Automatic annotation (TrEMBL), chains A, B:
This is Fusolin. Keywords: Metal-binding, Signal, Zinc. Residues 1-231 form the Chitin-binding type-4 domain. Disulfide bonds join 14-34, 93-228, 139-189, 252-304, 259-298, 265-305.
Length: 307, 307
């Protein structure tokens, strides 16, 4: 049992942010996608004839069981075709838990809705890097060995806003055992003194992407834990340093001077010869009126009457 | 002579934002990419032995000539191989103006540096749309006819932060004449009473992209105007409506109520059972310390001495 703590797993972020134990309809959940995931399960149970308590129990079970996003592969857990067709064929971020009446594994399908999932934001020191190493931290709430991990990254065409995650959109970037190590003092895992940690080079993506982590027990029960983690690289601003021409080293003089371990925690774009705030407000209105299917075409300049 | 006013051309945005006439080194320019473009030309002239005035003149000429981002194709302006190999072979956003000593067309190569160019931000009403119509507005400061336009969009793999725009990264999405029309009262073009306007379906992109516009005169001189425009689609937030399960229509009762033409111009994510502001501040530090080439690996947990 466990979950990804770095980059924080999707369901783990929803669990820790809280606000889901009460009110029962999930209206106290602040993140819109955690709230939507909760409400999809809550509304699914209500549509199928369940009471408010059955619906709140089903949706709260999805959040509470953030360390049991699991599926049983049985003894043939090394057969990739068995995993992809029988164990986790779909609803990958729910670990194929699709039955609210049967526990384990209940219904965790709210976690597979598409939309604006909140990502871990990783700043780039230089925008031309091809890979960024991240030190993964997986938090085991229950220690199980022997085991191994697989880590996947979504293909570049994946769009978190509209797509479900599927095996055909995942690229394996890590496969093998990770030994248990003592958690560091800054660890994100408070449930245990041991964590699984490893560095993987993450292919840089220009869009928000998903990392998929599989923690598979090497045993005849073949229990595996599957978690989605939402991530985005944040680009450094300014000119690409490789295109930057520097001035020659110089010393100048004249009567007009204008001629020559801790860190820090729109009207700035106004100049003496341009009111950017005013222009940009008019430009924002222009975008709204001259883009999209409901744009101003002829009505502001054409008048008609019925003969 | 002219420039794209909607979506605003790159060089046109730099011109209108100002701050470049003085001080001469461009330090008064507020947008970092307009400032970098200016300073690249200014520093190029200084490196080649020019004075401060020659360097400021060259860089200011690049901004002032926002309606003359042009190249002469001669009588064979319809030959695409002549345009792509001889007229505008490279420095596409400068219209291949690469000679600060020779005017026209001077040196406008600062406009082809890569980096965080400020885009026109177009909001999406629905994230699943495949194309978004935009009504292009091209502002002619001098009226010339006959003429035609070509509009291109960068390929999906284009990365504004690191790449120069090239013909191999451009897809034609419009070719033909656009008739002159009276400007609307909300027009972005104050230089003339006539504009060129047309609607083009823009392929949705999940990243910041470039629109390339060619305004070609149909005449033996074969003058053509070439402009880059930076654009980004802004996604709508929340659950993808096609995945949204709605509750059945219901009426409930009980003693605990918790059981059941103008528009508007982080502590919100705290709940009663989670301090998000505190957690996220610790999570931001974790990202900085456990990602990148300078991450904490062994130094916080390992000590060594020389035998």
């Amino acid at each position: 049992h466990g979950y990804i703590t770095f980059p924080i797993a999707r369901q783990r972020r929803c669990n820790v942010q809280g606000g889901f134990w009460w009110p029962p309809d999930g209206s106290g959940i602040p993140d819109p996608m955690c709230r939507a995931a909760y409400q999809n399960v809550y509304n699914k149970v209500l549509q199928q004839g369940g009471t408010i308590d059955q619906a709140a129990s089903a949706a709260q079970y999805m959040f509470q069981q953030d360390n049991e996003y699991a599926a049983l592969a049985g003894p043939n857990y090394l057969d990739q075709n068995h995993i992809r067709n029988n164990v986790v064929p779909n609803y990958l971020c729910a670990a194929h838990a699709t039955t609210w009446r049967i526990r384990p594994f209940g219904d965790k399908t709210g976690m597979d809705v598409s939309g604006s999932w909140t990502p871990t934001v990783i700043p780039l020191q230089d925008n031309t890097v091809s890979t960024v190493p991240i030190e993964f931290e997986f938090c085991p709430t229950a220690i199980h060995e022997p085991s191994f991990f697989e880590i996947y990254i979504t293909v570049p065409s994946f769009n978190v806003y509209t797509d479900q995650v599927t095996w055909q959109q995942l690229i394996n970037i890590f496969t093998g055992p990770i030994p248990l190590v003592q958690r560091r003092p800054d660890s994100q895992c408070n449930a245990n003194n041991l964590v699984y940690r490893t560095t993987v080079g993450i292919p840089v993506r220009q869009t928000q992407f998903v990392l998929y982590v599989r923690w598979q027990r090497n045993d005849p029960v073949g229990e595996g834990f599957y978690n989605c983690a939402d991530v985005i690289f944040a680009h450094r601003l300014g000119i690409n340093e490789e295109d930057k021409i520097r001035p020659p080293k110089m010393k100048c003089k004249g009567n007009d001077k204008d001629c020559y371990h801790y860190h820090k925690c729109e009207r700035q774009y106004n100049t003496k010869d341009f009111n950017y705030v005013e222009w940009n407000d008019d430009y924002s209105d222009y975008i709204e009126n001259h883009t999209g299917i409901n744009r101003d075409m002829c009505d502001s300049t054409t008048k008609c009457c019925y003969k």
